Amino acid sequence: LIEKCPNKDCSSYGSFSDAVLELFKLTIGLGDLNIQQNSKYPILFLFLLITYVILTFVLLLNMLIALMGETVEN
Amino acid sequence: LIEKCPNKDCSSYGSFSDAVLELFKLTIGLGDLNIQQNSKYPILFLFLLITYVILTFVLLLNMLIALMGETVEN
Amino acid sequence: LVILSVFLYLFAYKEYLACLVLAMALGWANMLYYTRGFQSMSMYSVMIQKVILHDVLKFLFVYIVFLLGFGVALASLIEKCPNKDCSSYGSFSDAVLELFKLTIGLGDLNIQQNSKYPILFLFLLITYVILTFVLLLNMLIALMGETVEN
Numbered sequence A, B: 001l002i003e004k005c006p007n008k009d010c011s012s013y014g015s016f017s018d019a020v021l022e023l024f025k026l027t028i029g030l031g032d033l034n035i036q037q038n039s040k041y042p043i044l045f046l047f048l049l050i051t052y053v054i055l056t057f058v059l060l061l062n063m064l065i066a067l068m069g070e071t072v073e074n
Numbered sequence C: 001l002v003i004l005s006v007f008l009y010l011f012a013y014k015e016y017l018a019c020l021v022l023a024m025a026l027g028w029a030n031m032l033y034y035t036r037g038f039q040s041m042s043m044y045s046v047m048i049q050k051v052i053l054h055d056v057l058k059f060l061f062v063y064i065v066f067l068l069g070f071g072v073a074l075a076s077l078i079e080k081c082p083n084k085d086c087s088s089y090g091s092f093s094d095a096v097l098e099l100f101k102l103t104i105g106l107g108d109l110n111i112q113q114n115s116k117y118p119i120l121f122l123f124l125l126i127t128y129v130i131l132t133f134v135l136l137l138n139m140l141i142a143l144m145g146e147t148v149e150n
């Protein structure tokens, strides 16, 4: 979704590796959501970013309730 | 609750989308309760902000409890 | 609140915005009465009964005791200094404010507070943090009390 730009590129989601790194840092609480990523479709970019956030939170919550599985007597 | 000011980021809860973004990334742990106030009712501002935080924590924990309890067996 | 905001707005009061925004927020909160049986506003609908009874007032009493006692204990430890005083725990009110902001996740604990006993000051500050956390978590497991079937 990101457009080639003249060399910080106005976007930290540049090549595929930079987007993968930003997403990883996000699920590691090391990141930041900016609505300014040098994109022709900023609303679609924001939609997919928030979708990723929510889906990774769902995965994390699955693993959380799995490893907790309290039934504290049991 | 945020006063217009003559255009660098005097506030952080400025435009409506700005406020929605700052609240959203306050929920997901990328936000700070202590920002550039620039508001004329700062105690009411912080009361509403802490109320947002508390109510969305109660909502999040409600959903988390419903999940961790109801779906372990069904 | 709404009618008061209107009365203050047609008068030349700039204090109407507080009441108007509070009324807007309280109306969005009153929207619960219509959505109590929607499985998502469940916890609010049930904590109208649980937390309002006595546990929040017990918590408030114990928390005021913690706040006042530790405010005195920390304001006492601080030395009068020549006028930011190197210490945000100055008078009793400044220590009470710092402690309140702490339990509200608004503050910051520093080892440098201009005390003759900085280790005792740090000890009491961390003791306050841990005790308020214990209090909050008692109230938390009370408000949740899941037994999700029940």
Ligand SMILES: COc1ncnc(OC)c1C(=O)Nc1nc(C(F)(F)F)c(-c2ccnc(C(C)(C)C#N)c2)s1
Binding pocket: A026, A027, A028, A029, A030, A052, A053, A054, A056, A057, A060, B028, B029, B030
């Ligand atoms: C937009 O953010 C996200 N979107 C989708 N999924 C996500 O996580 C699955 C996230 C996210 O924020 N993840 C995080 N990971 C970690 C880490 F533990 F690795 F450090 C986070 C962290 C970092 C610093 N202090 C804490 C405290 C002390 C508060 C705790 N506990 C937690 S936060």
Ligand SMILES: COc1ncnc(OC)c1C(=O)Nc1nc(C(F)(F)F)c(-c2ccnc(C(C)(C)C#N)c2)s1
Binding pocket: A029, A057, A058, A060, A061, A063, A064, A065, A067, B057, B060, B061, B063, B064
């Ligand atoms: C308001 O509280 C909630 N309401 C509803 N759902 C929730 O979870 C989705 C929450 C909540 O706090 N969730 C969490 N967030 C994070 C963070 F990583 F982001 F910090 C959690 C975390 C932190 C450190 N290590 C883990 C491991 C990987 C060990 C696990 N498991 C998970 S846990």
Ligand SMILES: COc1ncnc(OC)c1C(=O)Nc1nc(C(F)(F)F)c(-c2ccnc(C(C)(C)C#N)c2)s1
Binding pocket: A029, A053, A054, A055, A057, A058, A061, B026, B027, B028, B029, B056, B057, B060, B061, B063, B064, B067
């Ligand atoms: C980052 O970790 C944190 N650091 C400090 N405070 C925190 O709580 C406010 C948190 C934390 O967990 N935040 C969360 N935000 C959200 C979001 F919905 F908004 F996306 C969370 C979420 C997202 C999607 N599905 C769930 C389910 C339904 C599984 C549940 N339950 C929860 S979780």
Ligand SMILES: COc1ncnc(OC)c1C(=O)Nc1nc(C(F)(F)F)c(-c2ccnc(C(C)(C)C#N)c2)s1
Binding pocket: B050, B051, B054, B055, C022, C024, C025, C026, C028, C029, C031, C032
């Ligand atoms: C469904 O809920 C909502 N949906 C969309 N928007 C909303 O507000 C914009 C809301 C909402 O609940 N708003 C509120 N207003 C107020 C008022 F104090 F002003 F009365 C609230 C209040 C009142 C008394 N004790 C508290 C606690 C104990 C939590 C503290 N601290 C909070 S809560």
Ligand SMILES: COc1ncnc(OC)c1C(=O)Nc1nc(C(F)(F)F)c(-c2ccnc(C(C)(C)C#N)c2)s1
Binding pocket: C065, C066, C067, C068, C069, C070, C073, C127, C131
């Ligand atoms: C109702 O409580 C209060 N109301 C108003 N003011 C207060 O203090 C100013 C207080 C209060 O609790 N004071 C405290 N004094 C001390 C001490 F230093 F003597 F040990 C406390 C302490 C310190 C370290 N470990 C513990 C234990 C062993 C319990 C653990 N874990 C307790 S706690």
Ligand SMILES: COc1ncnc(OC)c1C(=O)Nc1nc(C(F)(F)F)c(-c2ccnc(C(C)(C)C#N)c2)s1
Binding pocket: B026, B027, B028, B029, B032, B033, B050, B053, B054, B057, C102, C103, C104, C105, C106, C128, C129, C130, C132, C133, C136
């Ligand atoms: C040294 O700190 C303490 N010592 C003793 N007791 C304490 O609490 C009883 C504390 C403490 O940090 N309290 C806090 N209160 C609040 C508030 F909800 F009011 F905003 C906190 C807050 C602020 C901003 N974002 C969140 C997220 C989104 C992560 C959530 N959830 C939570 S944090």
Ligand SMILES: COc1ncnc(OC)c1C(=O)Nc1nc(C(F)(F)F)c(-c2ccnc(C(C)(C)C#N)c2)s1
Binding pocket: C105, C129, C130, C131, C132, C133, C134, C137, C138
């Ligand atoms: C602001 O609150 C948070 N925001 C985001 N992430 C968080 O997780 C790291 C936290 C958080 O709870 N921090 C805490 N640290 C401690 C400490 F034990 F070290 F003192 C906490 C504590 C203090 C007193 N009694 C307990 C009991 C025994 C009830 C337990 N368990 C836990 S609480």
